[PDB]
Structures are given as structure tokens and as C-alpha cells.
Amino acid sequence: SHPALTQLRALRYSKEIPALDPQLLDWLLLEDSMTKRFEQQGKTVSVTMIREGFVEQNEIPEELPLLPKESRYWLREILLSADGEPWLAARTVVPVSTLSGPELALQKLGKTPLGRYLFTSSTLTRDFIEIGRDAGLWGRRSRLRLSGKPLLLTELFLPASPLY
């Protein structure tokens, strides 16, 4: 596990998106993962794997209300670094029914960071996003659909990141 993932799981969300300055909203509402956006800053991005594998409902209490109830889910928790400096922690939960067809690849991603560049085959949409916060830090959670199949993606922005 990891202190940053512990922090990510403590974020508290608002049903309504706050009226933040537009520079900060550009970042939080971005329709993609942070990969290319961070590279844009003049950085090399790398992933540290914290935890990966199949888990049962009891391991995903925060996400369960937002996804289909199934026997198993694929869990992916990472730390994203920019030139060696941690900038983000992320937690992705995929119901196993979403793992079919091209989407089965979500399972073999490893240390490659997630991004729209990887799913050119599938159709991508987001039906919900909320902004959260904890102890001065910003986070967000989104339900994305690949070819109609859902997954939940949560991101915590570390203070080293450009949002601050």
C-alpha cells in the first residue's frame, strides 16, 4: 500500500462542482488522464505500481454504489511521477464484466500509464465527475464508459503537481 493512496481514500466530494478559478477547473474537468498533460510541462512520466489484482466487493466500499454489483473487480492503484517526482496517485476499479473484447487490455497495462492514446479502438464517454478535497489537497472521481462498459477512476493531485 502507500500513504498517498490512504490520502486518496479520504477525499470528500461535493454533488455540485465548486466555482473555482478557471485555471484549476481546466485541470480538474480535463476529458483524459493526466499523462499527456504532465508531459506537456516538459517532463517524462513513469508509473510506480502500488497494487494490482482482482478483488471482491468488500475491498471497494467507496466505489460499489457507482458500479454494477459483480463477484469480482480488477483494482489498480499507482503513483505517477514526473522526472522522478511524485505528482499523482490514482485508483481505478473495473467490474470484471467490463473486461471483454479490446477492454481486456486494461488488465495487462502494467507500468504503462493510462490515457486516451491507448483506447483509439473503443468509444469513450464520461457520465459523471465530482471534485473532492482533503486537507488542502484536490482530487476527482469519474465514471468512464468504454464501449458502454463502466469503470471508476479516482485521482489525488499531490502538492508537487502544477495545480498548486
Ligand X SMILES: COc1cc(C(=O)[O-])ccc1O
Binding residues for substrate, by number, are 34, 76, 114, 155
Closest approach of ligand X to the CB of residue 6, in Å:
17
CA distance 88 to 81: 7
Give the residue with the Cβ less far from ligand X, 10 or 119.
119
Closest approach of ligand X to the CB of residue 58, in Å:
22
Tell me whether strands 73-82 and 124-134 are parallel, antiparallel or unpaired. Answer: unpaired
Contact 153, 106 (CB under 8 A): no
**Which residues inside 54-93 make contact with ligand X, applying CB under 6 A?**
76, 78, 80, 90, 92
47 binds ligand X (CB under 6 A): yes
Long-range contacts of 17-23 (CB under 8 A, 24+ apart): 17/129, 17/130, 17/131, 18/131, 20/131
Closest approach of ligand X to the CB of residue 118, in Å:
9
Residue ranges in contact with ligand X by CB under 6 A? 31-35, 47, 76, 78, 80, 90, 92, 113-114, 116, 124, 126, 142, 144, 153, 155
